Design an enzyme around this catalytic site. Sequence first.
Site, short mmCIF file in Angstrom:
data_model
loop_
_atom_site.label_atom_id
_atom_site.label_comp_id
_atom_site.label_asym_id
_atom_site.label_seq_id
_atom_site.Cartn_x
_atom_site.Cartn_y
_atom_site.Cartn_z
N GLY A 162 27.12 14.84 67.29
CA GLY A 162 27.89 13.63 67.08
C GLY A 162 29.01 13.76 66.08
N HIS B 119 36.92 15.61 75.63
CA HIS B 119 35.65 15.65 76.35
C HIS B 119 34.78 14.41 76.09
CE1 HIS B 119 34.39 17.59 72.48
NE2 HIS B 119 35.50 18.28 72.65
N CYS C 44 31.77 15.62 66.46
CA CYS C 44 33.07 15.91 67.05
C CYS C 44 34.07 14.79 66.81
CB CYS C 44 32.94 16.15 68.55
SG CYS C 44 31.99 17.67 68.90
C1 LIG Z 1 25.45 26.46 76.57
O1 LIG Z 1 26.30 25.84 75.64
C2 LIG Z 1 26.27 26.36 74.34
C3 LIG Z 1 25.58 27.51 73.99
C4 LIG Z 1 25.61 27.97 72.67
C5 LIG Z 1 26.32 27.26 71.70
C6 LIG Z 1 27.01 26.08 72.07
N1 LIG Z 1 27.76 25.23 71.33
C7 LIG Z 1 28.21 24.27 72.11
C8 LIG Z 1 29.09 23.15 71.61
O2 LIG Z 1 29.46 23.13 70.49
N2 LIG Z 1 29.45 22.10 72.52
C9 LIG Z 1 30.34 21.01 72.10
C10 LIG Z 1 30.74 20.19 73.33
C11 LIG Z 1 31.80 20.92 74.15
C12 LIG Z 1 32.09 20.19 75.46
C13 LIG Z 1 33.09 21.21 73.39
C14 LIG Z 1 30.04 20.09 70.90
O3 LIG Z 1 30.89 20.00 70.15
N3 LIG Z 1 28.99 19.23 70.46
C15 LIG Z 1 29.24 18.47 69.20
C16 LIG Z 1 29.38 19.24 67.85
C17 LIG Z 1 28.22 20.28 67.81
C18 LIG Z 1 27.05 19.69 67.99
C19 LIG Z 1 26.05 20.35 66.95
N4 LIG Z 1 27.00 20.72 65.75
C20 LIG Z 1 28.11 21.10 66.35
O4 LIG Z 1 29.24 20.97 65.57
C21 LIG Z 1 30.29 17.33 69.36
O5 LIG Z 1 30.57 16.62 68.48
C22 LIG Z 1 30.48 16.87 70.78
N5 LIG Z 1 29.44 16.41 71.44
C23 LIG Z 1 29.66 15.98 72.75
C24 LIG Z 1 28.66 15.47 73.60
C25 LIG Z 1 29.02 15.08 74.87
C26 LIG Z 1 30.35 15.22 75.30
C27 LIG Z 1 31.34 15.73 74.46
C28 LIG Z 1 30.97 16.12 73.17
S1 LIG Z 1 31.82 16.76 71.82
C29 LIG Z 1 27.77 24.47 73.42
C30 LIG Z 1 26.99 25.64 73.37
#
Ligand SMILES: COc1cccc2[nH]c(C(=O)N[C@@H](CC(C)C)C(=O)N[C@@H](C[C@@H]3CCNC3=O)C(=O)c3nc4ccccc4s3)cc12
Lengths: 297, 299
Positions: free
Chosen positions: A141, A39, A143
């Site tokens: 950040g 992603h 991921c």
């Molecule tokens: C309505 O949506 C929600 C409702 C309720 C809980 C929720 N949780 C998440 C969720 O986790 N999303 C994913 C992203 C998805 C696509 C896997 C995500 O991983 N963000 C982080 C790690 C997160 C961030 C905070 N500390 C966590 O470890 C990461 O590094 C990534 N950032 C991005 C930014 C842009 C593009 C790719 C990536 S990938 C969504 C969500």
Amino acid sequence: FRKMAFPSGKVEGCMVQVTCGTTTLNGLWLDDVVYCPRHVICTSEDILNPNYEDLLIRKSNHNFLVQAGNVQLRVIGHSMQNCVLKLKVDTANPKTPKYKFVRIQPGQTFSVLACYNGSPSGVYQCAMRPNFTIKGSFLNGSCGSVGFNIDYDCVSFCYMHHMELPTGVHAGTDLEGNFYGPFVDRQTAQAAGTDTTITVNVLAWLYAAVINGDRWFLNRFTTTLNDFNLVAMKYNYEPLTQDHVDILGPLSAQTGIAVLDMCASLKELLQNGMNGRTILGSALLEDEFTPFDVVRQ
Amino acid sequence: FRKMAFPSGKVEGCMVQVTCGTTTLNGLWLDDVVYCPRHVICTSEDILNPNYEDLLIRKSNHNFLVQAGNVQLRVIGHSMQNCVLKLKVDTANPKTPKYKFVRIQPGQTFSVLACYNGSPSGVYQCAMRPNFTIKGSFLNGSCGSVGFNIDYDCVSFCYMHHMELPTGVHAGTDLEGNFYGPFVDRQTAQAAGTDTTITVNVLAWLYAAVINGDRWFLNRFTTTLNDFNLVAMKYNYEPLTQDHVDILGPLSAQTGIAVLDMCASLKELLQNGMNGRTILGSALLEDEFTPFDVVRQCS
Ligand SMILES: COc1cccc2[nH]c(C(=O)N[C@@H](CC(C)C)C(=O)N[C@@H](C[C@@H]3CCNC3=O)C(=O)c3nc4ccccc4s3)cc12
Ligand SMILES: COc1cccc2[nH]c(C(=O)N[C@@H](CC(C)C)C(=O)N[C@@H](C[C@@H]3CCNC3=O)C(=O)c3nc4ccccc4s3)cc12
């Protein structure tokens, strides 16, 4: 006893950043391939219901910015494997350790190297819960940060970070891009199954207690494995597998306490409580030390 | 929110093995100097009552075997600084990071890289206790393992490991070879002063619980600084200074909870107990996170 991570240097030397547009995550540079969550190719609109095949068709090698620090590594190929992107680069990483990709089981522990913009920030031990979450410490950040074990200088990579559940626990994939648990990589609130206590690790902890002279809980009984497993589930404890019984073998031999005798001891603790008494100075049973962790310490 | 150590790579590239006779421990190789506990020169007979200057003058450069992996480094000089030996070698360590030697204050935290036979084994976070012990995990052969903090690629070394007390806690020196606490590098059973709880760290960690969406321990009451300190001292907690209140400012600002309101929370926790509840999964009040530790991790 305490949570001890593996020394992180062999993994630090493999961390890079991968940027598409304004989206930057961490990647893992081994030989001439960089591995990262797929992603990175997504925009804010995309992540809701991403069509990864269609998104990747629009991408070319020259759309990917891979950097070791501020040094760009030129991308010469890209492919997607499940939820991970594999970017072939024109430079083999000279810091590549001996390594393997492994898929771990619930209860197994590993070290996490938390990274931001390809820069390592901290290291800590995690256990894979029976519901396939980890209780990590991850911010925006993070991921692409990876989890790993080290055995005789070979790094076994077992986790790549993808998501924070609404309950604050974390979810991710193995290095082939397959999620642990039922989760999917999209911007959606997802729930894990109800968690349970990791029985094999509680037993390892009781062996650790016995090794250190704390053995009041050893009883005169034994149990069959099937009888134990049926009782364990009534107290929200995982059933034991045959592999659990065998990884307890070394601790059973060291203490002279048969695994099934320890199971009978644990069964009595479950059915009666601990009566204010402690085990290894704690009122609670610990379930995030594996048999190897007890022996490793 | 987790106990988080610094990444250890910059330190791993500095660990070597130092052998004198039958005694082997770890050393720290920075530029062309290896630092290690001086009692590497001691036999089982020497350590009971070592006269270190007398023992060292009887050693030659060639009595020291320094190994970096499979490679032996030639010792071309040596000197003693308090409880640390400094071996000059004829090879410079190209992996030497930017570094400083610092002596930390009680209540401050650092990462330990536990090492055996010059090889890194594990990394974890420790705090310097008010009684100047650390609650580590160290076995036979761990001496010379070091503790450190990292700030913008600069490694501040603060601890070298020497001893495990009868109680199971640990004692060592700074990198100038001066012990933390009243301990001595001799083979004797040594007791520490009575320990106390690091109050500013407990408060930092209660703030961490709130930043992580947990508020069950908060209350509607407040306290003065002096009235809190009276109760804290009664429970063998360290006094909270105005410097500590200020240091907690960023965390109070982020959460909107005044420091003295959090003190009123902790006072109630001390006087009522936790009643079988848990904070961040812990059944005990945690005092090994500094305000910096919380801030660096939560943001
Ligand atoms: C309505 O949506 C929600 C409702 C309720 C809980 C929720 N949780 C998440 C969720 O986790 N999303 C994913 C992203 C998805 C696509 C896997 C995500 O991983 N963000 C982080 C790690 C997160 C961030 C905070 N500390 C966590 O470890 C990461 O590094 C990534 N950032 C991005 C930014 C842009 C593009 C790719 C990536 S990938 C969504 C969500
Ligand atoms: C009656 O004597 C005792 C009574 C009650 C409790 C006690 N504790 C100790 C004690 O700690 N001694 C020091 C050594 C002193 C000389 C600094 C020591 O063994 N350090 C270890 C790390 C230790 C070992 C176990 N895990 C710990 O961290 C270390 O690596 C070193 N080993 C040697 C071996 C030979 C020569 C130099 C060194 S330096 C003695 C003692």
